[PDB]
């Protein structure tokens, strides 16, 4: 039998490929590219007239299949959820576009946090999955994932662009093609995201905490108490337009301090795991502390994890979680496959799943008969097995 397909889903939109582990991971960032449109158009929007979407998936799907991957779509169907929280559109719509445009011969749909543990051989919690927005923490038990201890933040990195557009604009020399120093704004009213990104992609990094905090002291120059150290060296970014964007070495340092500010807001990038452990059964915390899993492209941001853990550990001493939990370590389990890759692999794994797959799958027929696909959030999930 032929296995299997893997879908774009967020930072993940770039994750087009097909099973097994050998597939290309074709990079689609994914947009249309419709001629009459300003390009590109991101067609990946919630709260969208579905029609608009309809026509978009139709066309994307058509496209991806059409070209991009050899697919011969009638034989392989997988939809990964990288969402649990996807609203019913568009899922309804996704199916809806199948289904009839695309005749779909049963489909199994599955979440990332389960596809996550598949690789470590671990059937237990914690999974933190961070990438395009809205970040999710979800202890997975052996077996049930447990939603009741459900947590979510931005960003992950979508907001880094405001933080960066802004800051780029708060620094400010562009050395324009006329050798003039000019304002960014106004030579440009905006910085396209691709710039922002590029700059980010290669320039942002996460500092060690003892000094991550002096970076914070720059904001807070209290009564002169600043102990924000000299920045690294400045960078001439060449900018397109035959412009040069000079960048302070100091921004590399600040952008990443969003992730980590403590306002009167909780420092949540850092909890999540902590606000959930307090929520979790005591009888399982023993596994959850200690056994942590981090997937998602944004943890490719270097030094992230350093702090991260330091922070967390740091925080474990805040009484509030301390008295509440007592302490212990944390150990990271990590695959060797890259952070982005674990969803993708656990999609490959799934071809193994063929004896099961067509069983735990939602039938085409059913759907043809009702068209109802269960949601965990519905009062009528039909027992599909009636069929």
């Amino acid at each position: 039998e032929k296995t299997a397909v893997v879908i774009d889903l967020g930072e993940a939109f770039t994750k087009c490929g097909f099973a097994g582990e050998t597939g290309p991971r074709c990079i689609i960032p994914s947009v249309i590219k419709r001629a009459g449109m300003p390009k590109p158009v991101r067609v990946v929007q919630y709260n969208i007239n579905t029609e608009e979407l309809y026509s978009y998936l139709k066309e994307f799907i058509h496209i991806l299949y059409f070209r991009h991957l050899l697919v011969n779509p009638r034989d392989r169907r997988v939809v990964i959820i990288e969402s649990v929280l996807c609203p019913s559109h568009f899922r309804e719509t996704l199916t809806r576009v199948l289904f009839k445009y695309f005749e779909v011969p049963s489909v199994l749909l599955a979440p990332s946090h389960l596809m996550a543990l598949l690789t470590l051989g671990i059937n237990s919690a914690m999974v933190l999955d961070c990438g395009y927005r809205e970040s999710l923490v979800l202890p997975i038990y052996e077996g049930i994932p447990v939603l009741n201890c459900w947590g979510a933040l931005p960003l992950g990195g979508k907001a880094l662009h405001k933080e960066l557009e802004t800051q780029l604009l708060e620094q400010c020399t562009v050395d324009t093609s006329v050798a003039k120093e000019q304002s960014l704004p106004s030579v440009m009213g905006s910085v396209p995201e691709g710039v922002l990104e590029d700059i980010k992609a290669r320039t942002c990094f996460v500092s060690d905490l003892k000094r991550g905090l002096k970076i914070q002291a720059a904001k807070f120059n209290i009564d002169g108490n600043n102990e924000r150290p000299s920045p690294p060296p400045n960078v001439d970014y060449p900018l397109d337009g035959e412009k040069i964007l000079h960048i302070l070495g100091s921004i590399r340092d600040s952008v990443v301090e969003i992730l980590f500010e403590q306002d009167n807001e909780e420092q949540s990038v850092a909890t999540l795991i902590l606000d959930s452990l307090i929520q979790c059964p005591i009888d399982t915390r023993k596994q959850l502390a200690e056994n942590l899993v981090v997937i998602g492209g944004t943890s490719m941001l270097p030094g992230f994890l350093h702090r991260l853990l330091a922070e967390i550990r740091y925080l474990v001493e805040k009484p509030k979680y301390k008295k509440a939990l007592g302490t212990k370590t944390f150990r990271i389990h990590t695959p060797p496959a890259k952070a982005n890759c674990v969803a993708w692999l656990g999609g490959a794994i799934f071809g193994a799943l063929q004896d099961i797959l067509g069983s735990r799958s939602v039938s085409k027929e059913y759907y043809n008969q009702t068209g109802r696909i269960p949601d965990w959030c519905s009062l009528n999930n039909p027992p599909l097995e009636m069929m």
Binding site: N123, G143, P145, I282, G326
Partner: protein, 370 residues
């Protein structure tokens, strides 16, 4: 070749006749997961039993099929026996005859359904039900004397003289180990440490077994416990969290001697033994005072014998000598009796065969009780 299988509400003690200790000892519990419509991972069992249910407490809803020594859910009870025979013992029920245990003054429906399942479902060659209190005498090798076999479901006192039972003297009390656990949860919550869920109930039961002891003088011990913080001990939970039980440590087991605390509106376990002896013949009372046996695992509280001695002595005549028989191995005293009885060549005649069941019916169990 025969099997002894005690059908305890708390723990299932199973093994082969002639053995010293039971081969398979596991909790008699079924754990079904709180599964939502969200997809679950692989290696998922619809219903877990015994050590597996105790390991996965977090998600599993633990439901005891036996309530006050009565089988409420028979379908789950069959799954306990199925795990006992096929998995734990690694023996076919068709091969060996099975010796079963019943509490005294139980509903007639239990014996009727019990025999039907073993002969029809499991197709056992023979099955004999025995009284738990009677078996405990074989473990001690004593024909005369009263037994206080206190279980998780119920507590009963059955006086037997020279191997002759006084049915009118038999007393049953619904107060047992499981009710004490629920009482401990409530008073710990008043202290500060809150325990609500089924998984937490089992953790509090494990805490109870370690810390709790019987006081000789309840009022004097609480007065001293209030004054000094020497009795106060710490306990480490599965989580890093540590708890200090305080005065509630010895307060839980008091309910056995004063049921008014739980609100049972009944006499204490020491009063039940005395009341049973008073219902007994005047001549044999002397021997019952001389041979007061304590059986079951609910009498494994440190210093229960000391409190019992004082209370019974106060009730009993001043001239009479009161001797309490409390052997180190009380927990497995009922099963050991079953093993000794099953081993005895005389008992070979007492077995009810499949042929006898088919000819007579399920009513045969009622005729061959006593």
């Amino acid at each position: 070749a025969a099997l002894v299988v005690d059908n305890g509400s708390g723990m299932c003690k199973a093994g082969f006749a002639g053995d010293d200790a039971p081969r398979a000892v596991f909790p008699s519990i079924v754990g079904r997961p709180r599964h939502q419509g969200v997809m679950v991972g692989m290696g998922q069992k619809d219903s877990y039993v015994g050590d597996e249910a105790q390991s996965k407490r977090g998600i599993l809803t633990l439901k005891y099929p036996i309530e006050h020594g009565i089988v409420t859910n028979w379908d789950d009870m069959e799954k306990i026996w199925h795990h006992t025979f096929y998995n734990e013992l690694r023996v076919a029920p068709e091969e060996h005859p099975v010796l079963l245990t019943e509490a005294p003054l139980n509903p007639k429906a239990n014996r009727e359904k019990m025999t039907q399942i073993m002969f029809e479902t499991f197709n056992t060659p023979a099955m004999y039900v025995a009284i738990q209190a009677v078996l405990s005498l074989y473990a001690s090798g004593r024909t005369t004397g009263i037994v206080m076999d206190s279980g998780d479901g119920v507590t009963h006192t059955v006086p037997i003289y020279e191997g002759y039972a006084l049915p009118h003297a038999i007393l049953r009390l619904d107060l047992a180990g499981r009710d004490l656990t629920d009482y401990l949860m409530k008073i710990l919550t008043e202290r500060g440490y809150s325990f609500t869920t089924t998984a937490e109930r089992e953790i509090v039961r494990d805490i109870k077994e370690k810390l709790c002891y019987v006081a000789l003088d309840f009022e004097q011990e609480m007065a001293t416990a209030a004054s000094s913080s020497s009795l106060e001990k710490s306990y480490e939970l599965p989580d890093g969290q540590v708890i200090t039980i305080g005065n509630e440590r010895f307060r839980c087991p008091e309910a056995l001697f004063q049921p008014s605390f739980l609100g049972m509106e009944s006499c204490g376990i020491h009063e039940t033994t005395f009341n049973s002896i008073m219902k007994c013949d005047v001549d044999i009372r002397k021997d019952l005072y001389a041979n007061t046996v304590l059986s079951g695992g609910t009498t494994m509280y440190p210093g229960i014998a000391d409190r019992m001695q004082k209370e019974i002595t106060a009730l009993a005549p001043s001239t009479m000598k009161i001797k309490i028989i409390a052997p180190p191995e009380r927990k497995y005293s009922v099963w050991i009796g079953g093993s000794i009885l099953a081993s005895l060549s005389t008992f070979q005649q007492m077995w009810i065969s499949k042929q006898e069941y088919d000819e007579s019916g399920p009513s045969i169990v009622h005729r061959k009780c006593f």
